[model samples]
Target: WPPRSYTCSFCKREFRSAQALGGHMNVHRRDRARLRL
Candidate 1:
């Protein structure tokens, strides 16, 4: 088990692995606009 908790400072999201964390972080760069409705 990797058992590593990788977190994103920008989104404050926690991931169990580096791959998951990186993928999630990538979204932040491309997705800036949020649905404010």
Candidate 2:
């Protein structure tokens, strides 16, 4: 695991690793889109 930090623009969530951050952002995007429609 790499030591990189990332902030999710959509949720304002912070992650310790870029890979984890990307995964979390994807979840947020999917959830938001699901709720919108």
Candidate 3:
């Protein structure tokens, strides 16, 4: 699962992991500084 990932609904960008997606979400929304769950 080294390449597992999810797509961003707003930016269409893919992250290697859910955690990464949450981190990158900061670029779209500053309030998302980290993955809560």
Candidate 4:
């Protein structure tokens, strides 16, 4: 069977594992660097 997953609150991206979800959330933090002026 396939693993369970959850959607990211920031990107609404799906992740099959908690670790994956955590990693995806890092994208939000990385995005902040681009927004910095």
Candidate 5:
């Protein structure tokens, strides 16, 4: 909690709650799956 409730490991964007971070990670996770091929 340097200054916010959550931190984005990819972009270092601070979030106000888990809901936001959880929602944001979905995009990264999906992108990761596609790259596996």
Candidate 6:
């Protein structure tokens, strides 16, 4: 039952909480978007 964590599919990283992953993904999203432009 200890699998209640979020995993970052892009980087193979795991976060024990949703907000933690959300915060980290913010940077990824920004960089990805910039590169798409």
The global Cα lDDT (0 to 1) of model 3 is 0.66
Which ranges of candidate 3 are over 4 A from the true structure? 1-3, 29-37
Model 2, 1-37: lDDT tens per residue? 2346568788675677777777877776355344443
Q: Pick the candidate with the highest TM-score.
A: 1
Worst 10 residues of 6 by lDDT: 28-37
Candidate 6 lDDT over 1-37, as tens digits, reads 1388777666567778887777777667444443343
The collision pairs in model 5 are none
**Clash counts for the predictions, in order:** 0, 0, 0, 0, 0, 0
What are the runs in model 6 whose C-alpha is more than 4 Å off?
Answer: 29-37
Over the stretch 1-37, how does candidate 4's per-residue lDDT look in tens digits? Answer: 2358788778765667787777777756645444443
Q: For each candidate in the order shown, give its overall lDDT on alpha carbons.
A: 0.68, 0.65, 0.66, 0.67, 0.67, 0.65
Q: What's the TM for model 3?
A: 0.42
Candidate with the larger lDDT of 5 and 6: 5
**Who is ahead in lDDT, 3 or 5?**
5
Query: Which 10-residue window in model 2 sums to the lowest lDDT?
Result: 28-37
Native-referenced Cα lDDT, model 6: 0.65
lDDT of 3 by residue, 3-22 (tens): 67678676676667787777
Give the distance in Å from residue 32's predicted Cα in candidate 5 to where it truly belongs.
Answer: 15
Ranking by TM-score: 1, 2, 5, 6, 4, 3
lDDT tens digits, residue span 1-37, model 1: 2356867777675677787777777767655677662
Q: If scored against the real structure, what TM-score would every candidate get? A: 0.50, 0.49, 0.42, 0.46, 0.48, 0.47
How much is 5 displaced in model 6, in angstroms?
Answer: 1.0
* Candidate 5 residue-wise lDDT, 1-37, digit = tens: 4655787686567778887887787666434443343
RMSD of 3: 9.0
* Number of the top lDDT candidate: 1
